[PDB]
Design a protein around this ligand. Sequence first.
Ligand SMILES: *[C@@H]1O[C@H](CO)[C@@H](O[C@@H]2O[C@H](CO)[C@@H](O[C@@H]3O[C@H](CO[C@H]4O[C@H](CO[C@H]5O[C@H](CO)[C@@H](O)[C@H](O)[C@@H]5O)[C@@H](O)[C@H](O[C@H]5O[C@H](CO)[C@@H](O)[C@H](O)[C@@H]5O)[C@@H]4O)[C@@H](O)[C@H](O[C@H]4O[C@H](CO)[C@@H](O)[C@H](O)[C@@H]4O[C@H]4O[C@H](CO)[C@@H](O)[C@H](O)[C@@H]4O[C@H]4O[C@H](CO)[C@@H](O)[C@H](O)[C@@H]4O)[C@@H]3O)[C@H](O)[C@H]2NC(C)=O)[C@H](O)[C@H]1NC(C)=O
Ligand SMILES: *[C@@H]1O[C@H](CO)[C@@H](O[C@@H]2O[C@H](CO)[C@@H](O[C@@H]3O[C@H](CO[C@H]4O[C@H](CO[C@H]5O[C@H](CO)[C@@H](O)[C@H](O)[C@@H]5O)[C@@H](O)[C@H](O[C@H]5O[C@H](CO)[C@@H](O)[C@H](O)[C@@H]5O)[C@@H]4O)[C@@H](O)[C@H](O[C@H]4O[C@H](CO)[C@@H](O)[C@H](O)[C@@H]4O[C@H]4O[C@H](CO)[C@@H](O)[C@H](O)[C@@H]4O[C@H]4O[C@H](CO)[C@@H](O)[C@H](O)[C@@H]4O)[C@@H]3O)[C@H](O)[C@H]2NC(C)=O)[C@H](O)[C@H]1NC(C)=O
Ligand SMILES: *[C@@H]1O[C@H](CO)[C@@H](O[C@@H]2O[C@H](CO)[C@@H](O[C@@H]3O[C@H](CO[C@H]4O[C@H](CO[C@H]5O[C@H](CO)[C@@H](O)[C@H](O)[C@@H]5O)[C@@H](O)[C@H](O[C@H]5O[C@H](CO)[C@@H](O)[C@H](O)[C@@H]5O)[C@@H]4O)[C@@H](O)[C@H](O[C@H]4O[C@H](CO)[C@@H](O)[C@H](O)[C@@H]4O[C@H]4O[C@H](CO)[C@@H](O)[C@H](O)[C@@H]4O[C@H]4O[C@H](CO)[C@@H](O)[C@H](O)[C@@H]4O)[C@@H]3O)[C@H](O)[C@H]2NC(C)=O)[C@H](O)[C@H]1NC(C)=O
Ligand SMILES: *[C@@H]1O[C@H](CO)[C@@H](O[C@@H]2O[C@H](CO)[C@@H](O[C@@H]3O[C@H](CO[C@H]4O[C@H](CO[C@H]5O[C@H](CO)[C@@H](O)[C@H](O)[C@@H]5O)[C@@H](O)[C@H](O[C@H]5O[C@H](CO)[C@@H](O)[C@H](O)[C@@H]5O)[C@@H]4O)[C@@H](O)[C@H](O[C@H]4O[C@H](CO)[C@@H](O)[C@H](O)[C@@H]4O[C@H]4O[C@H](CO)[C@@H](O)[C@H](O)[C@@H]4O[C@H]4O[C@H](CO)[C@@H](O)[C@H](O)[C@@H]4O)[C@@H]3O)[C@H](O)[C@H]2NC(C)=O)[C@H](O)[C@H]1NC(C)=O
Ligand code: BGC
Ligand code: BGC
Ligand code: GLC
Ligand code: GLC
Ligand code: GLC
Ligand code: GLC
Lengths: 389, 389, 389, 389
Amino acid sequence: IRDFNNLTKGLCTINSWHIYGKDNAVRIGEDSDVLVTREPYVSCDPDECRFYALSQGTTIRGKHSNGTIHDRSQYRALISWPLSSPPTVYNSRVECIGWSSTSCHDGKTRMSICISGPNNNASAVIWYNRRPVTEINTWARNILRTQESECVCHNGVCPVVFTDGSATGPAETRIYYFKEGKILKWEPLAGTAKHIEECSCYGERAEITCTCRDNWQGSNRPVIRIDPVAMTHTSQYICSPVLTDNPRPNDPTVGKCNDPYPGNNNNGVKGFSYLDGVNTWLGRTISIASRSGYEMLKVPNALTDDKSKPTQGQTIVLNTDWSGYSGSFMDYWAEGECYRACFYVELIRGRPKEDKVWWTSNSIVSMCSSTEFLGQWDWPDGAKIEYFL
Amino acid sequence: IRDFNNLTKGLCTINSWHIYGKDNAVRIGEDSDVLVTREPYVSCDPDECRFYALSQGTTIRGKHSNGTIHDRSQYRALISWPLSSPPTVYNSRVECIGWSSTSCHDGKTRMSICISGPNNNASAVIWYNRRPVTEINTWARNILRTQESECVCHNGVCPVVFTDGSATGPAETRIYYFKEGKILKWEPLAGTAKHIEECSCYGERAEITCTCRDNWQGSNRPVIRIDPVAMTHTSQYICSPVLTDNPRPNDPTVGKCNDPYPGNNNNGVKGFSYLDGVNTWLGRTISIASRSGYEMLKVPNALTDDKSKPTQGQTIVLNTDWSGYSGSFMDYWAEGECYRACFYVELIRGRPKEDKVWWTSNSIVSMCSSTEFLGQWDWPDGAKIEYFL
Amino acid sequence: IRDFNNLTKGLCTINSWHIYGKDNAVRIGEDSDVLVTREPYVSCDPDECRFYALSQGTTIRGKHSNGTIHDRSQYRALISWPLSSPPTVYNSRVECIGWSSTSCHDGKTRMSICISGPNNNASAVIWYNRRPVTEINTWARNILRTQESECVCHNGVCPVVFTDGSATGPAETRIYYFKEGKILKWEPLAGTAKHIEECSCYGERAEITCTCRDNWQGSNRPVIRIDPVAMTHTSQYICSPVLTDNPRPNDPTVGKCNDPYPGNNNNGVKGFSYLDGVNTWLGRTISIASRSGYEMLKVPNALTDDKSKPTQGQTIVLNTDWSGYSGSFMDYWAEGECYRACFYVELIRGRPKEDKVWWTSNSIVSMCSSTEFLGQWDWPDGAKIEYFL
Amino acid sequence: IRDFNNLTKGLCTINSWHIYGKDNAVRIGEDSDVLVTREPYVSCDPDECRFYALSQGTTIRGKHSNGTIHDRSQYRALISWPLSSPPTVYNSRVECIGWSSTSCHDGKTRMSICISGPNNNASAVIWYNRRPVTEINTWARNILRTQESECVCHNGVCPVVFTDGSATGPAETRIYYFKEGKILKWEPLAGTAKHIEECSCYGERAEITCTCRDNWQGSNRPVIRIDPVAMTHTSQYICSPVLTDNPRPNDPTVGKCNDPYPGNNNNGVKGFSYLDGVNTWLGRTISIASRSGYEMLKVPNALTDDKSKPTQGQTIVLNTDWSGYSGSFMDYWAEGECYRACFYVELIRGRPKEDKVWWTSNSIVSMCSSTEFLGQWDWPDGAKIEYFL
Ligand SMILES: *[C@@H]1O[C@H](CO)[C@@H](O[C@@H]2O[C@H](CO)[C@@H](O[C@@H]3O[C@H](CO[C@H]4O[C@H](CO[C@H]5O[C@H](CO)[C@@H](O)[C@H](O)[C@@H]5O)[C@@H](O)[C@H](O[C@H]5O[C@H](CO)[C@@H](O)[C@H](O)[C@@H]5O)[C@@H]4O)[C@@H](O)[C@H](O[C@H]4O[C@H](CO)[C@@H](O)[C@H](O)[C@@H]4O[C@H]4O[C@H](CO)[C@@H](O)[C@H](O)[C@@H]4O[C@H]4O[C@H](CO)[C@@H](O)[C@H](O)[C@@H]4O)[C@@H]3O)[C@H](O)[C@H]2NC(C)=O)[C@H](O)[C@H]1NC(C)=O
Ligand SMILES: *[C@@H]1O[C@H](CO)[C@@H](O[C@@H]2O[C@H](CO)[C@@H](O[C@@H]3O[C@H](CO[C@H]4O[C@H](CO[C@H]5O[C@H](CO)[C@@H](O)[C@H](O)[C@@H]5O)[C@@H](O)[C@H](O[C@H]5O[C@H](CO)[C@@H](O)[C@H](O)[C@@H]5O)[C@@H]4O)[C@@H](O)[C@H](O[C@H]4O[C@H](CO)[C@@H](O)[C@H](O)[C@@H]4O[C@H]4O[C@H](CO)[C@@H](O)[C@H](O)[C@@H]4O[C@H]4O[C@H](CO)[C@@H](O)[C@H](O)[C@@H]4O)[C@@H]3O)[C@H](O)[C@H]2NC(C)=O)[C@H](O)[C@H]1NC(C)=O
Ligand SMILES: *[C@@H]1O[C@H](CO)[C@@H](O[C@@H]2O[C@H](CO)[C@@H](O[C@@H]3O[C@H](CO[C@H]4O[C@H](CO[C@H]5O[C@H](CO)[C@@H](O)[C@H](O)[C@@H]5O)[C@@H](O)[C@H](O[C@H]5O[C@H](CO)[C@@H](O)[C@H](O)[C@@H]5O)[C@@H]4O)[C@@H](O)[C@H](O[C@H]4O[C@H](CO)[C@@H](O)[C@H](O)[C@@H]4O[C@H]4O[C@H](CO)[C@@H](O)[C@H](O)[C@@H]4O[C@H]4O[C@H](CO)[C@@H](O)[C@H](O)[C@@H]4O)[C@@H]3O)[C@H](O)[C@H]2NC(C)=O)[C@H](O)[C@H]1NC(C)=O
Ligand SMILES: *[C@@H]1O[C@H](CO)[C@@H](O[C@@H]2O[C@H](CO)[C@@H](O[C@@H]3O[C@H](CO[C@H]4O[C@H](CO[C@H]5O[C@H](CO)[C@@H](O)[C@H](O)[C@@H]5O)[C@@H](O)[C@H](O[C@H]5O[C@H](CO)[C@@H](O)[C@H](O)[C@@H]5O)[C@@H]4O)[C@@H](O)[C@H](O[C@H]4O[C@H](CO)[C@@H](O)[C@H](O)[C@@H]4O[C@H]4O[C@H](CO)[C@@H](O)[C@H](O)[C@@H]4O[C@H]4O[C@H](CO)[C@@H](O)[C@H](O)[C@@H]4O)[C@@H]3O)[C@H](O)[C@H]2NC(C)=O)[C@H](O)[C@H]1NC(C)=O
Ligand SMILES: OC[C@H]1O[C@@H](O)[C@H](O)[C@@H](O)[C@@H]1O
Ligand SMILES: OC[C@H]1O[C@@H](O)[C@H](O)[C@@H](O)[C@@H]1O
Ligand SMILES: OC[C@H]1O[C@H](O)[C@H](O)[C@@H](O)[C@@H]1O
Ligand SMILES: OC[C@H]1O[C@H](O)[C@H](O)[C@@H](O)[C@@H]1O
Ligand SMILES: OC[C@H]1O[C@H](O)[C@H](O)[C@@H](O)[C@@H]1O
Ligand SMILES: OC[C@H]1O[C@H](O)[C@H](O)[C@@H](O)[C@@H]1O
């Protein structure tokens, strides 16, 4: 009775952002059985949207929260839970086991991907309709890894971006095209992006756009544009001088379209953009040095205009509060003639910036676009670290 | 397969009130993971009735409960949970994010509205079928705010009363008429009510009646009567000398139909009435000074008779116990030829009246009408504050 | 699509009892959020059987557990929860509010009844399909009260036995016949039973048999047999000298069919029997003085034979362990040509017998009949009281 | 609308194993309400796979966890819970009561079997569609007991292996053939296996293969092959010199097909194999002395070749970590032309090996086969015992 979803609509006009979800997980977890997480995201099914993240297999107050600054262990899993509830022991659904993930619904059912293993011997398991269907072994033997936010599907084809290799030099990025959890095709990265991590993707009018993290040399963000019908892609960087990785140098007046904008090496943060002509909005941390603050900037033609500057903006998280990863999603099953852009921001608490506790976790805030020009508030995690001492 | 509900029935004859629900949330939350709340209510779908409230994004025993006397923060959300269970971390569904709300089912699906933001820049998000559909920016830049109990729908049209502006002088009240979460029309307040807050509404025979709080000058309650087909309304005050706001002066022998009954300024409490000729019942606190006690009084023709006094009553909460906000709802999908009036009372515990704890929360008690003349009990919150010290 | 259930089958031959359910609630609640309860029972829907009990509106470890020896408060409610799970804050469904209850499914949906109020002004609320439908005021102004185990329905007619009046003298017992939560008829108690409390009922071949507690004078149990088609009944006592109330005198060699067997006044315990000719089994405590131990005895023709003695038995709970109330239920929707008799035993822990704790609660054990002659085990609550100190 | 499942497919080619599930129960239970368990397994329905285990009727942190090294009590039950979640008080479903179990879905609904009682008087209760249908009394009066992992069905016939009698000498093993919870037939053990415990079974091409534990004399594993259409079986031992019980002597160069391989008496561990010609994989502990480590070895023709040695392998749990019972299951309702072999390993923590705590419990790890040659990781329980002190 269900058909595959097709990306038949364009983006709605984004004139501001409204609050969509917030879980207050760290506040609540100070005195309830909330799992330690990081790398969260949001993804919709045709009848529900849910929060997702990588659990660390312990509660925050639990003694096993000590050491959760670490990224890869056998105790991590992709979990999902109801929108704006916290990720608790009792309400979280485990989608698959591992320390890197993506997930998306194709209109009929959901594909989830988790990678696990030691650094030199990791493998992806691709689940479809809550069953494992395909496995992929590491090709470069160096932390096979993927998006950490939702993938996007079109007529059953769900492309996913993976990287295997160094985070501080050339690596081997591949785009896999899945259908019903099976590999139709894969391609090596093409175009002018020089390094790819942690792609944040969205779809509109039969094209999928991903904004990624050049961890090696670039403080501008690489962009991959995927045609899920032809199963081909292109890549470049956001041309705009409004630089959106972190850490980063100060904004110049002219950016770079086909190479990394230099100044900071071997670091970054997962982030996102919506690239739609004049209707283009970029997210970034406010700090150029650290994962603090978060703002959206309207930067008309950021993708293609190497001198484009902001014409409007919205503060999401004050620079006096911690942010983190951010990513895109949309409710492809909503009513109306256009898709409304959404995003989330991971609000990281604990280590390394707050080292009086022994753990690292996060909460989530999420916003979607409005055609109104709405007033802005800031949305901090809200927990008091001293309470955990 | 579902059609919009129509208000085709009149009210059942109210001869007494029977216990409908009670969650004992503060008792239970002394040793379980119960969220701090305030501004609760009850609302029915065609196949379930649920408790609703504004969470404070912390448990009661949690250290973040300190400071929850405050009304507006980024950590509040409209939550719902099963009838007479407590609002726990693990059983509460987040409907939307914000610090002021309303919600109602139209027979097909549910509309929920949450307002958030700083005082001078708040916005409403109107959700329908669990998706955001419309947003409304503040028009007076002073705590845009709404009912804090359920709205009512008729043939898909669900009117909602909002206020923006001062709580201690003239403000800008609007009635919005929504259908499928979209704005059909709005109107500014008309009639003789001089200030409107926190409307408590019910529907019968194609009319919606709301009893509100005149926070500015009136200790009688303003009333708005809305025709959801014509999308028009009128307003006045309850004429009766049985005054039902709090705090209030002592009852006179003659009330006021078209102006605030004076004596107390710049305060009030959310409350409700059922105004149905001889079948008219008013709720109020027992104390004229504080939110303590709660009683129902049968006051025939209270709406229109400026000398009407009680002919029957029922004590709901003794004056030696704390009460709080109260509001109306009905199960529009019940069997029978008439709609049975129901209400809830918020039983506030903690600050400011019980200041040995650092938190403010509440539990809920709820009653519905009977055509029998039933014996009465009183229904306290039941928690011992000393246990929380 | 569902029709009312009819009692078309006879009882299966009972040759022994097998374990059906057990919740270990007190053990588990020593370190999890388990509600304090008493007066439990079991009742089936067409697609699920559940545990039921009167909550006390606090967890066991909670400070509000102090005082829960008391029977009637505003903090009690009928709750249900999944078979053999414990009654927790997070998995318990509130069916109605009050301190006395019954509940049964008619094949289409469930009727639940809760009574609340002060001793001289109590009222029953009859819920059907999870909505209140009928209310009944106290008729004798002295703790209106009902079965504390499931009722039984036949072609939509669900009789329920109520008592109002003294527990230590003549009282006013009524049988109400409900359909879809509405009163079709009621009758005063007739026959030779002189006092009725806490009836435990089952149905077979279009008749409902209830075994009750004569709290006033009788240590034999009164029996009410109800024809739910004619809506009439009879009553007498179990004739057998195998006395089954508690406390009680020692067993004589000849019982009494039409009067209380004397020796103990003004006390008792809820209990049950299956009265089916040679296929007759009685439950009782092992102790004649206290609620300790529990055994089933096959006593052919106990109902009608005033010299009938046991021919077989099964120990359920050793006399060195606490028991409590017990009652009957069956899964009227099971497969097969006959109905299998089941029962539960309430295993009371805490006050008054274990007074080093300040609370009273219980767990549940439940058995059903087998046509095999199965080996027996004993089934204690299993908690160590010292752990709660 | 559902038909009985038939075993129409063969096994997929097993070239390695991928992570399927892991619950981290002991880590998480250090600070959440996780039930103490042992003897876990996994079993699929047509629309969900779940974890199963025998609860001990207490949480790990609870004071009643003291003494849970013991195997048989009245506080045990078969529980199930969602895949890779932990077995918590609030998310666990009780399937039946007892201290030995099996369970399987026949394509229409699920059969579950639990045994309880004292050692000399135990009985099995066979539940079907969540109702008790058949009971079986002990035949040898010495701990009637069964598989502790899933059974397998074919056209409605679900064979189950039981043992009653000594664990240290000849015993009375029976194969029962159930359909809709009713006994069609049973047979005594035939063939050359000399003692049978704790069979781990799987089905393919209309045959069911079970690998068991010879607790008496054998360090090779007995195998029972059952034809569920003819309702007949055969038995022998795995011929291979790759010995897979524990404890065990060192591997010889030639095994035994029709007798126990000697060297260790009166002990063992539940384990499993997939016996499919060249596509044969055996699981075993790494240690020959204790339940530590776990590895899979590809041993072509292990069943029939008494000199067969490994040609490939995969380490699942390092020898420096505790393992435990292991068993087979498959998702018979997955897509594709073949059934993918899966297994679980019980990771036992606490007593007797870690005796600074007073409890014994476990977590679960589970893997399924891949046709890829995937890299390997090890999968420890992950809890730090010192945290529980
Ligand atoms: C209630 O809520 C509402 C709604 O949210 C609030 O209103 C919002 O207020 C915020 C804050 O002011 C606004 O965001 C800022 O928007 C401006 C862009 O708008 C300005 O510029 C526009 C473009 O002008 C240029 O081009 C036009 C033609 O296209 C031309 O006409 C003009 O002459 C000029 O050449 C103007 O069009 C626009 O005017 C319009 O709107 C006005 C209202 O804002 C109105 O008054 C006008 O009439 C007209 O209608 C307006 O002038 C962004 O520039 C700004 O972002 C910069 O600054 C913030 C800090 O404030 C910074 O964090 C951003 O990153 C960014 O600045 C950095 O990057 C730049 C780009 O590289 C760089 O140049 C800067 O130096 C700076 O760089 C440094 O910091 C970064 C980050 O740390 C670092 O990486 C660098 O290295 C470096 O160190 C904000 O986004 C909203 O747009 C506004 N919304 C609406 C709908 O009005 C309202 O205030 C609330 N009310 C109350 C009472 O609180
Ligand atoms: C078992 O349960 C049952 C059921 O619940 C219990 O029975 C209930 O008992 C309660 C408590 O007594 C009753 O509530 C009160 O009801 C009266 C109204 O009924 C009286 O008056 C009626 C009207 O009489 C006038 O008009 C009629 C014609 O219409 C005329 O005939 C008559 O002469 C007179 O002119 C009478 O009809 C009625 O009689 C009927 O019922 C009697 C039983 O009650 C029965 O005996 C008769 O035969 C007949 O059938 C009866 O006399 C309310 O007036 C009263 O409310 C006032 O008082 C309470 C405190 O008790 C107060 O809190 C209320 O706010 C209110 O008083 C305040 O406001 C007034 C209005 O402005 C003001 O005038 C007062 O001075 C007072 O004001 C002060 O306090 C307020 C609040 O703090 C403050 O704001 C002000 O500023 C100021 O300081 C109660 O609601 C139930 O009706 C009754 N139910 C039933 C079905 O019987 C039963 O008791 C329980 N059993 C046991 C053993 O416990
Ligand atoms: C493995 O599990 C199995 C299955 O559970 C275990 O087997 C079960 O074992 C138990 C315990 O022994 C049995 O329960 C008892 O059953 C007897 C009834 O059976 C006896 O009597 C039958 C009737 O005999 C009379 O009539 C027949 C004709 O109808 C006639 O032939 C005969 O001559 C005589 O006239 C016999 O038919 C029956 O024999 C059959 O079964 C035998 C096996 O049991 C077998 O050996 C035979 O071959 C034959 O097949 C048998 O002799 C009940 O009487 C007994 O209940 C009384 O005693 C218990 C305490 O043990 C007490 O708590 C009960 O309340 C009751 O006694 C009180 O009440 C009486 C009635 O008023 C009174 O007379 C007593 O004085 C006593 O009263 C005192 O205490 C009470 C309570 O505290 C107090 O209120 C009073 O005031 C007073 O102070 C038991 O129910 C099971 O039936 C049996 N099941 C099966 C299937 O075999 C097996 O043991 C386990 N294995 C192991 C190794 O553990
Ligand atoms: C990334 O991940 C990948 C994938 O997991 C990792 O690659 C895996 O690496 C592991 C570990 O090395 C491998 O497992 C071992 O496999 C060998 C079997 O393969 C060897 O032997 C094969 C058979 O050879 C014989 O026959 C062939 C013809 O059939 C003939 O040609 C040959 O001459 C010989 O006669 C070879 O075919 C095979 O070669 C192939 O693969 C090689 C890669 O492995 C490749 O290099 C070749 O080119 C070729 O393609 C290979 O040589 C198992 O033997 C071994 O299991 C034994 O040893 C482990 C300990 O390491 C032990 O725990 C096992 O129990 C077992 O040894 C015990 O039992 C034996 C049987 O009775 C006994 O003989 C031993 O003495 C020993 O007994 C003692 O211990 C036990 C247990 O404690 C005790 O009970 C006894 O009493 C006694 O005390 C392993 O299973 C994987 O197969 C391999 N997978 C793949 C796909 O490559 C990779 O390493 C990872 N990368 C990194 C960087 O980490
Ligand atoms: O009816 C008057 C009062 O009587 C008391 O016994 C009840 O407990 C109160 O709740 C009631 O208000
Ligand atoms: O492959 C051999 C070993 O390599 C290690 O790096 C992995 O962590 C182990 O799990 C593995 O068994
Ligand atoms: O060594 C790092 C590991 O320490 C503990 O196991 C932590 O619980 C785990 O999250 C972390 O990966
Ligand atoms: O400053 C007031 C705030 O303090 C803390 O954050 C409380 O948890 C929050 O409820 C409150 O709004
Ligand atoms: O006074 C007796 C009452 O004390 C406390 O409220 C107990 O929590 C309650 O159960 C009991 O009814
Ligand atoms: O005596 C052993 C028993 O002790 C306690 O009851 C434990 O909680 C239980 O698991 C165990 O069987």
